[PDB]
Write a protein that binds this ligand. Structure first.
Ligand SMILES: Oc1cc2ccccc2cc1O
Length: 222
């Protein structure tokens, strides 16, 4: 398949990304608590449902939530201010809460079943969100870094296999603050550092110019 791109909702961020986040790729956004990573996830879950003329892929979404941070009412607001029907947008997001890191790993295998089911339809899965990818692994493997890295590595390999095999954009969030961080090392296809700036602006930079945007009723925008 050719590489598809999903607009983020921000012209600035899209330019930094070469058009949007890519299918057949893992995009990792990392930054401190409150930097806006989950707002970007919510916005992408709407944008991907637009036609390509508007920066989408007519795609379905699968969302793995590790922190109980998915908000359907926020999806509704973004959809209504992106000219989409909110009920339809929500009906094309498959949602699951991961109870721990082992369940999170099983959910990725379960996602493949729904991906296969939708593959030849008019609304194939085009976006898989894992928010937050690292939170359970971090809490469960305190004092056991070597074992944590083994399990994360297999989890990321599973996500890569899905991105490439099924032409999906995988979007993952990672909280990194004071003294913290191996990030995801070099595993993601693309690492995006997100931070708060003056006056509530958000600033994004590729790791390995900068885009600036705001969180609004449209999700994010310039
Ligand atoms: O109904 C489902 C929703 C999911 C969401 C994310 C990951 C896996 C899922 C599997 C399902 O059957």
């Amino acid at each position: 398949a050719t590489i598809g791109r999903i607009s983020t909702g921000s012209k600035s961020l899209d330019k930094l990304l070469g058009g949007g986040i890519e299918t057949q790729a893992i995009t990792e956004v990392f930054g401190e608590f409150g930097s806006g990573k989950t707002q970007l996830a919510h916005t992408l879950a709407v944008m991907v449902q637009l036609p390509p003329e508007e920066g989408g892929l007519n795609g379905s979404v699968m969302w793995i939530d590790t922190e109980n941070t998915f908000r359907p009412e926020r999806i509704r607001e973004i959809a209504q201010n992106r000219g989409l029907d909110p009920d339809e947008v929500l009906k094309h997001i498959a949602y699951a809460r991961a109870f721990n890191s082992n369940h999170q790993m099983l959910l990725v295998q379960q996602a493949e079943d729904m991906i296969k089911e939708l593959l030849n339809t008019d609304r194939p899965v085009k976006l898989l969100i894992v928010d937050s990818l690292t939170s359970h692994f971090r809490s469960e493997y305190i004092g056991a870094l070597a074992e944590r890295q083994q399990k994360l590595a297999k989890h990321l390999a599973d996500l890569h296999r899905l991105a490439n095999l099924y032409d999906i954009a995988v979007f993952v969030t990672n909280q990194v603050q004071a003294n913290g961080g191996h990030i995801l090392a070099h595993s993601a296809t693309l690492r995006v550092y997100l931070r708060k700036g003056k006056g509530g602006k958000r600033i994004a930079r590729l790791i390995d110019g900068e885009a600036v945007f705001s969180i609004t009723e449209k999700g994010i925008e310039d």
